[PDB]
Point group: D2
């Protein structure tokens, strides 16, 4: 039987006997992701080049997600990669959920048309205070729903909740997300590692050894493959689909990494664990880091459990 994103979210909400506020959130996000897809694919670009003859793509992305979330009446605190301060929804539009999002990750390399994506995480608000930036300061464990949209060769929405990870394919002919992978689970061990090897000069001693273990296996088994798209959503999804390990580790120059905990690492960490993988900073789980700043960074290693554990074995070996 066919299933859509909207109908699927409605069914799950009906099972749990919820109020519909989260479903109205998820549907609003779905509308915003489709408008980003249409724009990322350059619909109407002929008008920019004068077939008769405006905002830039990350500005438009932020406006779409922001405006769809406010007008969902389901949110109260919004954190975006693009805004210094969390946005507190006006009282007339306030709901109970805190959404942290990256409206367009990978945007640095969109001029070469490589894959980009939207990342989001949803927390129920826990305090009884007036809403503030503080409500966004929850660990990833607290996530109610998380996921990402990947605008690749086709457009897919990957949704993670307690019931598992599900993947939805965008059908541009009808503007519908079609359920194509139910309850996905990552391989126990993979054949690909993903990290920017151009910066090997700054690699932590552990990272140097583990990557050395993948290219020059001690037993002389076959080497792993290397892939690095450079757009976080693309690398993590390939890791989910094919297994393997993705690394953005900390080094001496960047003791807490470069990727952002609230709207890059946590949503991705939440997807990985619900699909049976791991996600660590090296010292602890990403979902266990408690942030003190909504834009603070975290190092992240994620993927198949057997690969992330071998990294931890090597990492431990260097203290």
């Amino acid at each position: 039987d066919v299933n859509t994103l909207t109908r699927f979210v409605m069914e799950e909400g009906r099972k749990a006997r919820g109020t519909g506020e989260l479903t109205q959130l998820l549907n609003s996000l779905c509308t915003a992701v489709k408008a980003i897809s249409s724009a990322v694919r350059k619909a109407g670009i002929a008008h920019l080049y004068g077939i008769a003859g405006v905002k830039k793509l990350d500005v438009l992305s932020n406006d779409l997600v922001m405006n769809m979330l406010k007008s969902s009446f389901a949110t109260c605190v919004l954190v975006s990669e693009e805004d210094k301060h969390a946005i507190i929804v006006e009282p007339e539009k306030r709901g109970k959920y805190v959404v942290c999002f990256d409206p367009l990750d990978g945007s640095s390399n969109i001029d070469c048309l490589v894959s980009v994506g939207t990342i989001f995480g949803i927390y129920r608000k826990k305090s009884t205070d007036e809403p503030s930036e503080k409500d966004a300061l929850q660990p990833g464990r607290n996530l109610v729903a998380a996921g990402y949209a990947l605008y690749g060769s086709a457009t897919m929405l990957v949704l993670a909740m307690d019931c598992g990870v599900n993947c939805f394919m965008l059908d541009p002919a009808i503007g519908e997300f079609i359920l194509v992978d139910k309850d996905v689970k990552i391989k126990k061990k993979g054949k690909i590692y993903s990290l920017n090897e151009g910066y090997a000069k700054d690699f932590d001693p552990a990272v140097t050894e583990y990557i050395q273990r993948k290219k020059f296996p001690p037993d002389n088994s076959a080497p792993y493959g290397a892939r690095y798209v450079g757009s976080m959503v693309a690398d993590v999804h390939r890791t989910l689909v094919y297994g393997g390990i993705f690394l953005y580790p900390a080094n001496k120059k960047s003791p807490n990494g470069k990727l952002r905990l609230l709207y890059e690492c946590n949503p991705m960490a939440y997807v990985m664990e619900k699909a049976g993988g791991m996600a660590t900073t090296g010292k602890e789980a990403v979902l266990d880091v408690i942030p003190t700043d909504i834009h603070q960074r975290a190092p992240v290693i994620l993927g198949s459990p057997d690969d992330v554990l071998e990294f931890l074995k090597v990492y431990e070996k260097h203290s």
Copy 2:
């Protein structure tokens, strides 16, 4: 003034006072490219999953059929066909088309960027057309380029007049000229290759890569990017500069990429854009193939990076 792929080709063909045969060939390719793009973005996938109750095979069918019915071709070589296809006599034209209808599709399970690559030759002589008409060196190319089905769909066309970049506007199904007479940066800051095969690397490749991470002159290291889909990596090299490598080693002494419909069109585009493309031993466009599916090693990109690689390669005798 606004310009499209279709009008652009007509204007050039009218300039050169040609017969219109290549303009039709290109028009058919472009039509095939919009259909591949439509299917790759999974339009109608809702019917596959029962809303009312293969992709490299389809791409091939689209390109084969649009070229056959263009009446401009006589020999077609595809990654997907073991043997060349000879156009029916009543439909024969004067051109040979080599193509990979959808490269990267083996990893389309992760929605990686994929693309269509093509190169066009004039056939060899008024005899019966044959596979030998496709055994020309890349120097002979009349036109080459690629379609990239990435975050957006772009068609890159290289001819004697240079390299031009056309963006597909899906709202109207038209290719819009957005980059006129493209030229690659003289030097870039990114290198692209699967470092997982380091165990098999040639000394020249090992040394050259060591130079990218650990610069002798103290300058900043290059960044690494490797999508694993040749159209996606090569296009990034064109737009951003840098170097792309799939070199020869001892286990694959002639490489992995295919000479006719992967390497030659991309070297042709590169040279036309001011870049270089080498086998290590010689220019890609100078290899004379003896098999339509033969492979070649390829290093292509910004001239100073390809020249810097060649110095190391020369240095290893």
Copy 3:
């Protein structure tokens, strides 16, 4: 502030504190409407014509399957099926849906406007579900409306809260709310009927039209419009005011339009928008059907025009 069909339906459903079954019906229907629109605008027609070497049946299959799978329905009535369709036990919900999946499809050869018509009833009896559950008068409708595949694709939804119009944005595949709480003009300037049956017109119909061409008060004559596709004509009536007529004639002594899945939904839209809809003897919404494909005469449109027709009808005893 922006609003979509889905968000509008959910907000209304949450206001009334319902279970979500009707909302799930509406979402499934909306999905089928977008697939029907895609097919009516001929997406993919190139593959029908061999680029790689019936419409009303698909419309019915899309709706049947999207409604079955909503778990919200138990009896389905389609213009395309002789007998009512009983949903299988594991998929049963409490709603009865009568619909024309593609009305006007007979003249789709000329690219005339076509449309989808639907009415939604809560099942009223506690018996095993059967064809009998669809024989309710239009007064009982919970929701009704239509999709017009015209110059653009618009969905018109009528409920207790009134009539709302949603324009399909094909760039993103979402229905956008563009007209809130729509209400028809009190009196209009256009009449709509197939004047080819004039030889068979009842005297009341002939006279009322004579008043439109030759106004007794010297005012301007009404304009005539008759497209021949009921969704197109009624929507023009809704948007511009005026009157639409499909009266009884000799080949159609009980009228021609179907009461269940054409007249009732349109009557419901009209009344909820402040218009009228009559058979001549009584309101369309008060007719009690005895057969799922039975016909009825219908005069509908602006309230002053329908009342002007009714006075003329009364005068003829």
Copy 4:
């Protein structure tokens, strides 16, 4: 074998051994028509309604700009511009184009079918271009046609080789040839005119319509259809046979439709399809215009129907 509008036109142009100027003009119109199709179907309307917190003017601008930039024209006459547009010398080509960029757009609020009508003349003298280059009779037309934005989007192209109909596949932004060399029925069963203005009908028009509703013989009355959008009624007339009338009366001694860009392009399609088109006094294509916006009466459609009309017309003369 599949065929597109672009490939078909190139084939016809290569056959005739023309310069390619008309092919560029025709190819520019096609791109303009698809952009009009995108806007009429309301792509991007969600941005207009604030998702991120003109139509006949845009239609005119798309055609004007695409034709100017085609380098194929020198004089442009539009329903939307008081004076002919003279192309700057560096963009001048040999053709004069007359057009209604969006006919029927007055009633587009109701999502009625709308359309684009065009006629193409070779300029006849070597003088500096002026309005006088557009005052040629329709006999002189080199190509004419219309785009219908109906349930789907179709392009109807008429030339000396005949009339051909192309369906836009929106999935790929391509016009697919679906009806080659179409010819109208010798006689039809539909008449089309605004009968609401019967008070103003010429006595001849009154009688002929009376014969259609009340056939003097045994046959069945004709059916009536009137969309009120000229492109839709004429196209239905072409596809189904019959007659379309916007005739002259005493309040409008020269009719209402404009000769250069409404009546002539439609007369040309009709004659090329084997139909007729008359003002009552003479063939539409024979009128010598003296003003670029002058009006003409027009009766067109199936030949036996127009001849029967002319017999009645002669009777009152």
